[PDB]
Amino acid sequence: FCGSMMATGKILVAYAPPGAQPPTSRKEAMLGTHVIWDLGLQSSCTMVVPWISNVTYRQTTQDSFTEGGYISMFYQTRIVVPLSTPKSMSMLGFVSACNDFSVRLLRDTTHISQSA
Amino acid sequence: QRRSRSESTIESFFARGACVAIIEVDNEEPTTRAQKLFAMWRITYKDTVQLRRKLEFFTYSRFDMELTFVVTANFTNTNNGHALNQVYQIMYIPPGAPTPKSWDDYTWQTSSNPSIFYTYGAAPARISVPYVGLANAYSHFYDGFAKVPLKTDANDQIGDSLYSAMTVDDFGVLAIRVVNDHNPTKVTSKVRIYMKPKHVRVWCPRPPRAVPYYGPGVDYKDNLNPLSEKGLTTY
Amino acid sequence: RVLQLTIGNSTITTQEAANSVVAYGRWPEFIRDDEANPVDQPTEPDVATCRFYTLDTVMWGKESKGWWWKLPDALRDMGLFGQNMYYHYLGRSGYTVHVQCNASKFHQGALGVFAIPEYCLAGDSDKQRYTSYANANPGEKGGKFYSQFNRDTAVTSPKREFCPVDYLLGCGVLLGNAFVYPHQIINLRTNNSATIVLPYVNAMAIDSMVKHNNWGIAILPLSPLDFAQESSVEIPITVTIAPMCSEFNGLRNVTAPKFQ
Amino acid sequence: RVLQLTIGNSTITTQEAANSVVAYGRWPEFIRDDEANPVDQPTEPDVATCRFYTLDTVMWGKESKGWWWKLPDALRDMGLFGQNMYYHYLGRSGYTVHVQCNASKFHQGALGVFAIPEYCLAGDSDKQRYTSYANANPGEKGGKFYSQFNRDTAVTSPKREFCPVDYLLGCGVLLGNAFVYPHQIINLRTNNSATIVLPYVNAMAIDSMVKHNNWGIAILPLSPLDFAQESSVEIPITVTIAPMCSEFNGLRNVTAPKFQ
Structure with missing residues (x-):
């Protein structure tokens, strides 16, 4: 969270394993694994998405048999901003991998094209 | 006692290697028709019948592989002009990799995908593939779906799927082309892929198919009368 | 010797107790991984919720052909098991299919479970x-076999549903070859019950x-039912x-x- | 020192962490009977189903009077806890009511939980x-307090619903005497959270x-909210x-x- 110092609020970030509809409102998205993230004390959360899967290895293609999950972020409470403070904040999101991530079966890529 | 039961073991029952496909690939002047300058083959075992009906005694299995490529050639004219010895490029493509579209794309650079150059006339190619499954065993006869249609869907096609299928594209393709540039004389090639499983472990036996196959499913349309005519009390 | 077969709160007694086939010789248990690094515990409804749920009652007439169910497709209607199966992304189970079918001493015939x-x-x-999905999962009401293969011709409204044949068993095998599955025969001469313990395969x-649906139950009347001299006779199967x-x-x- | 308060799968972090009132000094546990002759085990959803469910968000204006809920009345709408509560004849629980209510440095006021x-x-x-039953269990939407006691006069259609008064707290006590309950004060000057662990009483x-409904939560604004100079100001409570x-x-x- 890279807003001003005086801005506060709470954000609910949630994860849901596949099989159901993607969660639309907060009423059905608080059921899965979620982290209520505060904006006042710190300015950064850390949500470790666990490894729940029937198969040992998922795929790196758009497949429906091995679907990852869903990520959603709702307002727990509204952002509270005093006067003489900008109303439009900003947010940056990152990604990583823990020390148990692993891959196999090297193959080609699709992020290049040699226009000849 | 004193009978060798070694010929009937599972590792000895799958010792022979039967064909799985025959792929046409041609080398002619590029026409406006469907050019067979390169050909593709979806990797599956349920193309022939003798290997399919043999593997389907068993519900689950895990096994290595040993493929073998046997390549023949022909001419198309009676006293056709002579031609130099040709080089084939068999190329494996995992699921998700870019598929070739012309004879000579950027994807035939084989920079990640394993590929086999086979000079015509020599000994056949002979490569091994380990257990490339992602579950603990290959699953013959998957029962369920891939997708489940929900009540909250917009239309029918979103939750639509295909009965008894785990993935649309299993194990990718082979992509066989001829490396030499095309000629006014054309040489028809027919690659035959053999397949010999190794280190076979199987589970959960089931009875074999006894009406002829029809498609990659488990259904049937024709010849629903396998047993012949024979009297009741006649020896 | 009379089995006081009790699991959970319900109790299955009997008038005759002969055998109980454990399929493939393995009694069911949980996941047994000695190389498990996470020790956190999943959601197990195993404290009182191993109960005997009872499906619909079908009527085995003189010209009835067969029945078939799926598992755990048949349990999605009733029980608190039907609710845990929807909220949870993945789970495993083991079953004890118990089929009772009573008859007098003058009836004959034999099912095969x-x-x-x-x-x-x-x-x-x-x-x-x-x-389609709804036609491939009929639920606890099951489906019935047929005599001949009659494919559908309606192309604008395709039925999109099964048509299994009984002596082909639906799959394509013969019926005499279908005893390599774990089975049981309800011979109405001797016994009137059939219990099969199913592990997680x-x-x-x-x-x-x-x-996904792991197991499939199929009841085939191997010999047709016959009462004394009549042509209309119906006994129930549960x-x-x-x-x-x-x-x-x-x-x-x-x-x-x-x-x- | 920042509480990484984690129960089940969900996680309640904070920007400020001060205290956590355990009501009547007893942390919750199961039934502890050393003189128990039956050793059979009940149905405990305790393997992964201690989760934080989140109610509706109410808006604390300048002239709002109060809110009240009941427990386990508020949890019958959502969760798999709402399904176990209906199939089972009797059960016990313990709660952790966590009330967050953020505000800036220029707001003032103080709730009381x-x-x-x-x-x-x-x-x-x-x-x-x-x-009536439906008016005495409004669910997760809660109920609101009032200023004066206005009894109903419609006799052919009686409303059959509550009318609590805030400084009488509904019951009949004064409000200054209501601190003998286990409580917490969300003073918007210092903190912005309030967690109360409730045993089974x-x-x-x-x-x-x-x-039956064991506990009752009541949120009273002890001091009215005020922003800088305006007369319309709404912050949310969850x-x-x-x-x-x-x-x-x-x-x-x-x-x-x-x-x-």
Whole structure:
């Protein structure tokens, strides 16, 4: 969270394993694994998405048999901003991998094209 | 006692290697028709019948592989002009990799995908593939779906799927082309892929198919009368 | 010797007790991994919820052909097991299918109770593997076999449903070859019950239950029923399933698939 | 020092962490009977189902008076806890009510979060103890307090619903005497959170949950909210409840009471 110092609020970030509809409102998205993230004390959360899967290895293609999950972020409470403070904040999101991530079966890529 | 039961073991029952496909690939002047300058083959075992009906005694299995490529050639004219010895490029493509579209794309650079150059006339190619499954065993006869249609869907096609299928594209393709540039004389090639499983472990036996196959499913349309005519009390 | 077969709160007694086939020789248990680094515990309804649920009662007439169910497709209607199966992403179970079918001393005939793992049936239309969801999961009401293969001709409204044939068993095998499955024969001469303990057979260690169906039960009358001299005679068949040693994992929002 | 308060799968972090009132000094646990002769085990959803469920968000304006909920009345809408509470005849639980309410440095005011055991409110009509079921259990949407006691006069259609008064707290006590309950004060000067662990307080060892409601939560704005100089200002309040150490017993068929 890279807003001003005086801005506060709470954000609910949630994860849901596949099989159901993607969660639309907060009423059905608080059921899965979620982290209520505060904006006042710190300015950064850390949500470790666990490894729940029937198969040992998922795929790196758009497949429906091995679907990852869903990520959603709702307002727990509204952002509270005093006067003489900008109303439009900003947010940056990152990604990583823990020390148990692993891959196999090297193959080609699709992020290049040699226009000849 | 004193009978060798070694010929009937599972590792000895799958010792022979039967064909799985025959792929046409041609080398002619590029026409406006469907050019067979390169050909593709979806990797599956349920193309022939003798290997399919043999593997389907068993519900689950895990096994290595040993493929073998046997390549023949022909001419198309009676006293056709002579031609130099040709080089084939068999190329494996995992699921998700870019598929070739012309004879000579950027994807035939084989920079990640394993590929086999086979000079015509020599000994056949002979490569091994380990257990490339992602579950603990290959699953013959998957029962369920891939997708489940929900009540909250917009239309029918979103939750639509295909009965008894785990993935649309299993194990990718082979992509066989001829490396030499095309000629006014054309040489028809027919690659035959053999397949010999190794280190076979199987589970959960089931009875074999006894009406002829029809498609990659488990259904049937024709010849629903396998047993012949024979009297009741006649020896 | 009379089996006071009790699991959970319900109790299955008997008038005759002969045998109880354990399929493939393995009693069901939980996941046994000695190389498990996480020690956190999943959601197990195993404290009082191994109960005997009872399906519909079908009537075995003189010209009836067969019945078939799926598992855990048949348990999605009733029980609190039917609710845990929807909130949880993946889970495993083991079953005890108990089929009772009483008759007098003057009736005859013999059923055959099978339990086919991965029981893929056959469609009817020439479109291959072309079957809707609601027609491929009829639920606890089951489905019935047929005499001859009659494929559908309605092309603008395709039926998109199965048409299994009894002596082909639906799959394509013969029926005399179908005794390599774990089975039981309700011979109305001697016994009137059939209990089969089913372990968890699947390739994965744990797999989803909404889309996949592990076991398939098929009841075939191997010999036709006959009372004294009449031509109309109906005795009932009742099936009873108990989920043993279930466990679940990974909650999410509820999923209600459409069943038209 | 920043509380990484994690129960189940969800996680409650904070920007400020001060205290956590355990009501009456006892952390919740199961039934501890050393003189127990039956060793059979009830149905405990305790393997992964201690989660933080989140109620509705109410808006605390400048002239808003109060809110009140009941427990386990508020949890019957969502969760798999809402399904176990209907199939089982009797069960016990313990709660952690967590109330967050953020504000800037220029707002002021202070809430007060109570947890009244056996919170009997007062009806409005002169018919004594004359309150319908659906009006006495509003669910997770809660109810609001009032300024003056306005009894109902419609006699052919009686409302049959509560009318609590805020400084009488509904019951009949004063508000300054209401700090003998286990409480917490969300003073917007210093902190912005309030967590209260509630043990199982009831006369029986285990009691029904459809008809009885053990705890009652009441949020009273002790000082009115005020922003800089305006007369319209609304900040949100969000309540979060986690059922800890629940257990249930005695399955039956499902019960759906009417809520008009």
